[PDB]
Write a protein that binds this ligand. Structure first.
Ligand SMILES: O=c1ccn([C@H]2C[C@H](O)[C@@H](COP(=O)(O)O)O2)c(=O)[nH]1
Ligand SMILES: O=c1ccn([C@H]2C[C@H](O)[C@@H](COP(=O)(O)O)O2)c(=O)[nH]1
Lengths: 316, 316
């Protein structure tokens, strides 16, 4: 079934990864170097063996696609994926007068008091970003994130390059190009980033009037992260195909470090005992073609009928 | 046997690639997205089913490793891999007074007269680079090539970053890093390069005191190119391991477009009828550890006993 390579990656890490106690005090199982395809003509790979929220994934890809780096657009779709990194900024600023919120990463997952003055300051933070333009401009804006990496990569000559729109125009004029590459990885920023990008670069390819894409993902959370990563790039592959008048081919997912936090063993095992369902179907608005000016309503999921969601603690 | 994944890639493209008539008037068979490992503890992957010149490959990696971008170092080891791109520069300059040498790519492979005034100007060109310092500085120097990408990546703030030496020091201090990445791909240069790099980026990983490396190669000549590419990165993986006091793990080779020019079908088939031999062994100078100051004599191949070389026309 469409999603099986996903369940094969999980199983593979379960009985072959090594214990590697990295970035934290937790531990992981880990493999290095893996690859899996999905034939996108067979259906859209949104995992049916567990409920994944499509709205979150599409509202974030559009954000990237408009080249936007400000959280406000996300909060306006009840998308909180990125609040942490913005709010963190806030928290170490001079204009900040409140509970010291040092290491709320862990601290809001132990202390259950703390973790309530935490959705305190956040709800308060998010709200100001929604309403106060200058605050939004000051702390709502991440700076180095996919949207500006893809569409506004800073040159040294001090201009700004739109890799993604240049590449798309290359696909129309020279589809047989072996050079259709978008990279999110700038070595002059990379050492001072709180998150050097996980999705490092991708490559398009066309043959027989079909578009494929291959993603090199440097580091991957098999349980929480990869389910999302997959639908995100398979969606991009549909948008680009749609804009270039092309058919859709495969999405190829290549990994460097792929891991499973040990706090997730039970949850992944439960999942591995479910039987995939037939995959959902994507539907794009046939009248609109300029994919940079796409809206939520222009992208539809059909026949998604997952098993229930699986709550699981996030990585500390 | 060690080299089999190489023969499996060939076979795979032979009976599954599609005809794609790209960059030229020739044609190729093509697949997109492939991956293969080599367990470097089982021996060094220099193809035994055909004679590959190790001297060429090591003298070029050292060049990259010293961060050098001038051909002269290569010519001093009878390494001509890169003459073309240098000489091309020469040929369109004002100081050039000679036969017009337009499109000597093809032109020296049809005309057999031309192709003799061609090793004329070249032998003449190479010689001046060897002897005339200022000429060497003017036309011997490529500019954007792996050596300066790896070790002298230009910032916009106008400095110069040594990604490779920074990463190596990260491996010593933080081997469990999921961030050990060197990229050769600058989007502000990429559109004005005669050859946007084929070897796009690589990633190191350590576990159980073993070093692995994974290479994302965007575009690959299965017959002429890939045999070299493989020994080049498996060598890098040994050098770095040796410098960091580590054991050697696997070399993982990931491809985007992997192709076979149609002019190579017979030659690859002949090769596929030979039976691999036991692989050779690498030997590094145990006393010297600073790998940036390695010399030819510090790296030895043992027990390489290939089948004969296979002449084949280059791609036009
Ligand atoms: O979309 C995403 C974003 C992040 N990660 C995770 C995996 C790692 O736990 C973390 C990166 O930590 P470092 O890899 O940068 O050390 O990001 C994913 O799997 N998918
Ligand atoms: O070490 C190398 C260098 C080059 N190539 C080839 C494959 C392609 O024929 C060519 C690149 O042409 P474009 O891919 O840039 O279009 O480089 C290799 O396979 N290995």
């Amino acid at each position: 079934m469409l999603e099986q390579p996903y369940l094969d990656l999980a199983k593979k890490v379960l009985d072959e990864g090594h214990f590697k106690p990295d970035r934290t005090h937790t531990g992981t199982y880990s493999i290095f170097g893996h690859q899996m395809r999905f034939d996108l003509s067979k259906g859209f790979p949104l995992l049916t063996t567990k409920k994944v929220p499509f709205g979150l994934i599409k509202s974030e890809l559009l954000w990237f696609l408009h080249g936007d780096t400000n959280i406000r657009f996300l909060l306006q779709h009840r998308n909180h994926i990125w609040d942490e990194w913005a709010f963190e900024k806030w928290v170490k600023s001079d204009e900040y007068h409140g509970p010291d919120m040092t290491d709320f990463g862990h601290r809001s997952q132990k202390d259950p008091e703390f973790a309530a003055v935490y959705h305190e300051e956040m709800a308060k933070f998010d709200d100001r970003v929604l309403h106060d333009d200058a605050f939004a401009a000051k702390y709502g804006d991440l700076g180095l994130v996919y949207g500006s990496q893809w569409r506004a990569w800073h040159t040294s000559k001090g201009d700004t390059i739109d890799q993604l729109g240049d590449v798309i125009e290359q696909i129309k004029t020279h589809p047989y190009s072996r050079r259709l590459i978008v990279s999110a990885w700038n070595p002059e920023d990379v050492p001072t980033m709180a998150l050097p990008p996980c999705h490092t670069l991708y490559q398009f390819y066309v043959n027989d009037g079909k578009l494929s894409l291959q993603l090199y993902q440097r580091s991957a959370d098999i349980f929480l992260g990869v389910p999302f990563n997959i639908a995100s790039y398979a969606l991009l592959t549909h948008l680009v195909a749609h804009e270039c008048g092309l058919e859709v081919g495969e999405f190829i997912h290549t990994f460097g470090d792929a891991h499973l936090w040990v706090n997730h063993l039970d949850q992944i095992k439960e999942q591995l005992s479910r039987t995939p369902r037939p995959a959902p179907t994507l539907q794009l608005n046939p009248d609109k073609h300029d994919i940079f000016d796409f809206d939520m309503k222009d992208i539809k999921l059909l026949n998604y009928d997952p098993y229930p969601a699986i709550k699981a603690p996030v990585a500390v």
